[PDB]
C-alpha cells in the first residue's frame, strides 16, 4: 500500500489466498516444486524462519537449516508458485523480528524456545 493504486491492482490479482500464520522463530517445512527435466516433484526444505518480510506480492521469508554439517539459508518469495505449501511444525518464542544471530551459533546454543499458549 506504499505503491500507486494501479500497481496495487496489478499486483493483487496474483496474491496467494491460503498462507499459514508463521512468525520468525517457527520451524516450517516448505514444499518446493522441482523439475528434473520432464519430471515434476516436491522437495521438502525444513528449518527455522529467521526473517520475514511483509510487502504483499513482494513478501519473503528466510529459512535456515543445517544440512550435512553445512548451514544453508534459503530466501523464499511467499507468493511464488514454486512454494507449493508451507507447514508450521513448531512455534518459537523470540524477542526480535530477525534472528540473524543464529547465523553465528551452532547446536545447543542455537536452540529456540517453544511458544506455548
Amino acid at each position: 500500500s506504499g505503491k500507486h493504486p494501479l500497481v496495487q491492482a496489478i499486483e493483487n490479482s496474483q496474491l496467494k489466498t491460503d498462507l499459514p500464520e508463521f512468525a520468525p522463530g517457527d520451524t516450517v517445512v516448505v514444499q518446493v516444486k522441482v523439475k528434473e527435466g520432464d519430471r515434476e516433484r516436491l522437495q521438502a526444505f525444513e528449518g527455522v524462519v529467521i526473517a520475514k518480510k511483509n510487502r504483499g506480492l513482494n513478501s519473503a521469508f528466510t529459512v535456515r537449516k543445517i544440512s550435512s554439517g553445512v548451514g544453508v539459508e534459503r530466501v523464499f518469495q511467499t507468493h511464488s508458485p514454486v512454494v507449493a505449501k508451507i507447514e508450521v511444525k513448531r512455534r518459537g518464542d523470540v524477542r526480535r523480528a530477525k534472528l540473524y544471530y543464529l547465523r553465528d551459533l551452532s547446536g545447543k546454543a542455537a536452540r529456540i524456545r517453544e511458544k506455548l499458549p
Binding site: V34, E36, F45, A60, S67, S68, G69, V70, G71, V72, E73, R74, V75, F76, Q77, S80, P81, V82, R103
Partner: protein, 122 residues
C-alpha cells in the same frame, strides 16, 4: 563470488582440506567464479596419505558459495562456507565421496557424478 586468494573448503575426499583460488578461468579480466565455475587452485592443507599433495596446482569446480545463487523465481540460496571439488586435467571430478550439499546448477554432462554422489542436491 570466488576471486584469486580466496580460500575454499574441499567438499570431497580427494585428500585436500584447504585450497586457494589462483585463477578464475574462462575469459580475460574475469573477476569472480560462482557455483559451477571452474577454478585454478593450489592445495594449502592436505591429509597425510593422499593422492593430492600440498603445493599442487589443480583444477576445481565451485559447489558452494557464501554469496549465494539466484533462482528464477527471485530466491537466494546461501551456504555458510565456500567449497570446491577437485577435477582432472580434462575437467572431471576425481572424487568418490561428496560432502555437504550442492545445488542443481551442476546438472550437466561433466558434473553428473558430483550430483550423483552428493548427500543433498538443493
Amino acid at each position: 563470488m570466488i576471486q584469486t586468494e580466496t580460500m575454499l573448503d574441499v567438499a570431497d575426499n580427494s585428500g585436500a582440506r584447504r585450497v586457494q583460488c589462483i585463477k578464475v578461468l574462462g575469459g580475460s579480466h574475469r573477476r569472480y567464479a560462482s557455483v559451477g565455475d571452474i577454478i585454478k587452485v593450489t592445495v594449502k592443507e592436505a591429509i597425510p596419505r593422499a593422492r593430492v599433495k600440498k603445493g599442487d596446482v589443480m583444477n576445481a569446480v565451485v559447489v558452494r558459495t557464501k554469496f549465494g545463487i539466484r533462482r528464477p523465481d527471485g530466491s537466494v540460496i546461501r551456504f555458510d562456507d565456500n567449497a570446491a571439488v577437485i577435477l582432472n586435467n580434462n575437467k572431471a571430478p576425481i572424487a568418490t565421496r561428496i560432502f555437504g550439499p550442492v545445488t542443481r546448477e551442476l546438472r550437466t554432462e561433466q558434473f553428473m557424478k558430483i550430483i550423483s554422489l552428493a548427500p543433498e542436491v538443493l
